Design a binder for this molecule. Structure first.
Ligand SMILES: Cc1cc2nc3c(=O)[nH]c(=O)nc-3n(C[C@H](O)[C@H](O)[C@H](O)COP(=O)(O)OP(=O)(O)OC[C@H]3O[C@@H](n4cnc5c(N)ncnc54)[C@H](O)[C@@H]3O)c2cc1C
Ligand SMILES: NC(=O)c1ccc[n+]([C@@H]2O[C@H](COP(=O)([O-])OP(=O)(O)OC[C@H]3O[C@@H](n4cnc5c(N)ncnc54)[C@H](O)[C@@H]3O)[C@@H](O)[C@H]2O)c1
Ligand SMILES: O=C1O[C@H]([C@@H](O)CO)C(O)=C1O
Length: 429
């Protein structure tokens, strides 16, 4: 049995950034452990669908450990022991007793905390969860964690010049379709929605990304779903059967059909809401000295006066810091400012990349060009509700331009021929 004042449960983005803030706020050797089922120190998960997958000059660990991702220092394993932070790796926690402030591994081992941070992130939805016929075949791969990414790199090696099917039109599908395409696959994307990223992209924005993908050789199948997979004698996938009756041959299938907060260790013991562990503006759960951060938290969103959950890296980094800042700033009394999150989301693929700040509500306008034959494409969109601008999106922006639209989203300036001098409106705020 081991005892620590501070236990982080999860070896991910929030955990790494929590650790860095622990060290900034003067934590003393032996006081803090991070417990993780992964076999490596925390890292910048976004790299797994991008740089990790390049055919040359690829991100590899220890390169992308936190906090490089945001311009910070790179925390390698030796950083942690050097500071007496305990990296407890290859360790799945299967039982969590908030009552005893006690955690039990899979090996039966036992761990106590005074102060717990919950950063167990999100699961991957698998087609096997649904009982889909043949979803258990080989080379049907998911991508959450670096071992998944190493399995994806090996199948890419073994199957080059073959056929890839990407099941899903969210973030994963977008990036993984591009990455497979860059690694010399014939790629088809499959998804049921009217157009990709429908939770963020308008019809206009989606049509751009769809033409560009089409122009790059990616085939897109919409309005349907994978209802099953054929396999060969060895059990390797050979095709994807669709609900519309077509069959798509395949050597690799990559599925990105969403994620859920990894909260099962705590069902009952903590107030939940919108799928996540409910928290206040400091990331403390219903249970005193128990914190929840990153993808798992539902927390108050001051600036839209609402409870929200978000599944995004910027937020994992900051909520981790917030919680650490709220712990130490009650240890020594004083006071801490509440979390004030400006939503910030982004993605990159091929030569493209975009940013979104704010809330995607009310009516939209596009601006800039816009043309799928480049170059380099530079357009955006403003979301206007109640006269004010509420959200903005920008593809191919410079840093000045990106600070600009962020400043707009934060300030919510009012109104209207915005479509003439559109990017320009953001710079005059
Ligand atoms: C491939 C990919 C790309 C992404 N790209 C972007 C992007 O470009 N931009 C963006 O904004 N967001 C992106 N995200 C979103 C995501 O929010 C961040 O990647 C981030 O990881 C969230 O961090 P977290 O700490 O909350 O959870 P995680 O980083 O997932 O950390 C959870 C850690 O806890 C461990 N764990 C979980 N449960 C247990 C348990 N019961 N016992 C022991 N250990 C456990 C897990 O193994 C993991 O180590 C991406 C996500 C993925 C998967
Ligand atoms: N840039 C980024 O922000 C980024 C990049 C990669 C991953 N991620 C994160 O990783 C997690 C997983 O992402 P994801 O793209 O897998 O989920 P997502 O929630 O982004 O995508 C959900 C999509 O899956 C599709 N889908 C759902 N059920 C389906 C089915 N039965 N058949 C076919 N398609 C189906 C839908 O069209 C939907 O748009 C999320 O937390 C996400 O935020 C984020
Ligand atoms: O700007 C970003 O891109 C990186 C990613 O590739 C990791 O290095 C990341 O996480 C960001 O916040």
């Amino acid at each position: 049995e081991k005892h620590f004042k501070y236990v982080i449960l999860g070896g991910g983005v929030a955990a790494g950034y929590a650790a860095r803030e622990f060290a900034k706020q003067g934590v003393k050797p032996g006081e803090l452990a991070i417990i993780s089922k992964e076999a490596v120190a925390p890292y910048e998960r976004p790299a797994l669908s991008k740089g990790y997958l390049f055919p040359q000059n690829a991100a590899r660990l220890p390169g992308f450990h936190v906090c490089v991702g945001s311009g910070g220092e790179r925390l390698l394993p030796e950083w942690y022991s050097e500071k007496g932070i305990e990296l407890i790796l290859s360790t799945e926690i299967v039982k969590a007793d908030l009552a005893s402030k006690t955690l039990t591994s899979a090996v039966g081992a036992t761990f106590t905390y005074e102060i717990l941070i919950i950063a167990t992130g999100s699961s991957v939805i698998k087609l096997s969860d649904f009982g889909t016929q043949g979803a258990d075949s080989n080379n049907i791969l998911y991508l959450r964690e670096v071992d998944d990414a190493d399995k994806l790199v090996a199948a890419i090696q073994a199957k080059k010049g073959g056929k890839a099917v990407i099941v899903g039109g969210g973030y994963i599908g977008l990036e993984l379709s591009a990455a497979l395409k860059i690694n010399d696959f014939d790629v088809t994307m499959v998804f049921p929605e009217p157009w990709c990223m429908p939770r963020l992209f308008t019809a206009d924005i989606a049509a751009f990304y769809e033409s560009y993908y089409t122009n790059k050789g990616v085939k897109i199948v919409k309005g349907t779903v994978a209802v099953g997979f054929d396999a060969d004698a060895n059990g390797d996938v050979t095709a994807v059967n669709l609900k519309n009756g077509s069959v798509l041959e395949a050597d690799i299938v990559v599925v990105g059909v969403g994620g859920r907060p990894l909260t099962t260790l705590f069902k009952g013991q903590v107030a939940e809401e919108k799928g996540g562990i409910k928290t206040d503006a400091f990331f403390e759960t219903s249970v005193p000295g128990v914190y929840a951060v990153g993808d798992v938290a539902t927390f108050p969103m001051k600036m839209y006066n609402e409870l929200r959950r978000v599944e995004h890296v910027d937020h994992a980094r900051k909520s981790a810091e917030q919680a650490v800042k709220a712990i130490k700033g009650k240890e020594s009394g004083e006071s801490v400012v509440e979390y004030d999150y400006l939503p910030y989301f982004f993605s990159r693929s091929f030569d493209l990349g975009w940013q979104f700040y704010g809330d995607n509500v009310g009516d939209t306008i596009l601006f800039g060009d816009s043309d799928p034959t480049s170059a380099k494409p530079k357009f955006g969109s403003y979301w206007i509700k109640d006269g004010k601008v509420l959200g903005a999106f920008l593809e191919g922006g410079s840093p000045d331009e990106n600070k600009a639209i962020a400043k707009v989203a934060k300030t919510q300036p009012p109104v209207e021929e915005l479509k003439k001098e559109g990017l320009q409106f953001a710079s005059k705020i």
